[PDB]
Each structure stands twice: as C-alpha cells, then as structure tokens.
Amino acid sequence: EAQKQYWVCNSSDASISYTYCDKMQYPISINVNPCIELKGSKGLLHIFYIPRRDLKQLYFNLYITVNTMNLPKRKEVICRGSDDDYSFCRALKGETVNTTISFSFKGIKFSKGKYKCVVEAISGSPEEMLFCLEFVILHQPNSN
Ligand SMILES: CCCCCCCCCCCCCC(=O)O
Numbered sequence: 001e002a003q004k005q006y007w008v009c010n011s012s013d014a015s016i017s018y019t020y021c022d023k024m025q026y027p028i029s030i031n032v033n034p035c036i037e038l039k040g041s042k043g044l045l046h047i048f049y050i051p052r053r054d055l056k057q058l059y060f061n062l063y064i065t066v067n068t069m070n071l072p073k074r075k076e077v078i079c080r081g082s083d084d085d086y087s088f089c090r091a092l093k094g095e096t097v098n099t100t101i102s103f104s105f106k107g108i109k110f111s112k113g114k115y116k117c118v119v120e121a122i123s124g125s126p127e128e129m130l131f132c133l134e135f136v137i138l139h140q141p142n143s144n
Pocket residue numbers: 030076077119
C-alpha cells in the first residue's frame with residue numbers, strides 16, 4: 001500500500017499537508033483555525049491525540065527545510081516545570097488529549113516555493129519517541 005498523505009488546510013497563500021515519519025505510531029488529528037498564511041497569521045490549533053506515552057517533559061526537534069535548503073536543528077520545549085504548562089502535559093499514556101492552543105505565526109516575507117518541517121516529538125523522560133510528523137507547506141502558486 002502507498003504511503004498515506006494527510007491534508008490539514010488550504011489558506012489564501014499556503015497548502016498544508018503532512019505524512020508520518022519514522023516508525024508509525026498512534027494517529028494524531030490536527031486542525032488549524034483559520035488556516036495558516038505563510039505571510040503570518042494567528043489562530044487556534046486543535047489536537048486530538050491518544051498518546052503512546054506520558055506527555056510529561058514533551059519537546060520537539062524541528063528540522064525545517066526552505067526550498068531544499070536544510071536549516072540547523074531547532075529544539076522547542078513544550079511541557080516544562082510547574083504550572084502555566086498546558087493541561088495536556090499532565091496526560092498519561094492512553095489518556096485522550098482533546099485540546100485547543102493559541103498560536104501566532106510571524107510570517108515569512110517574500111514567501112514562495114515549498115517548505116518542510118519535520119517535528120520529532122519526544123517525551124516521557126526516560127525519553128522515547130512519541131511521534132514524528134513531516135509537514136509540507138506549499139506556497140499557493142497563484143498568490144504572493
Ligand atoms: C503537532 C503540530 C506541531 C506544531 C509545530 C509548532 C512549532 C512550535 C513553535 C514554538 C513553540 C514554543 C512555544 C513558545 O514558547 O512560544
């Protein structure tokens with residue numbers, strides 16, 4: 001069977017999809033409202049996820065590619081110490097995550113072509129992979 005492609009949304013200037021990278025684990029549902037514009041936009045990210053492991057200490061390595069040019073790794077801590085953490089950080093393996101998160105994307109000026117971001121999600125520390133997603137963000141060809 002062919003590899004499954006997942007579509008998230010189209011905005012006026014972008015088209016967002018992803019596939020599962022690395023080992024296939026539990027599925028995840030992602031929705032963005034309104035759809036992100038490469039130019040910059042804000043909104044709401046909805047995640048529905050039954051995690052493979054506890055979300056505590058959750059973090060992302062980000063490998064971003066900009067028209068075939070790879071950028072140095074980025075690491076983003078999501079679930080830290082004490083409160084102010086998202087309520088999903090206290091989720092344990094098998095416990096439904098069904099939440100909404102605010103986001104503000106600053107934008108890429110003079111955007112064009114195609115961008116990729118691989119999200120390597122690690123958690124449970126003891127650290128194990130949680131999931132790996134490879135997002136492809138196409139610039140709409142009929143828009144600046
Ligand atoms: C599951 C979809 C992955 C979405 C990728 C978002 C990348 C994270 C951006 C930076 C997060 C740090 C939060 C902050 O301190 O403002």
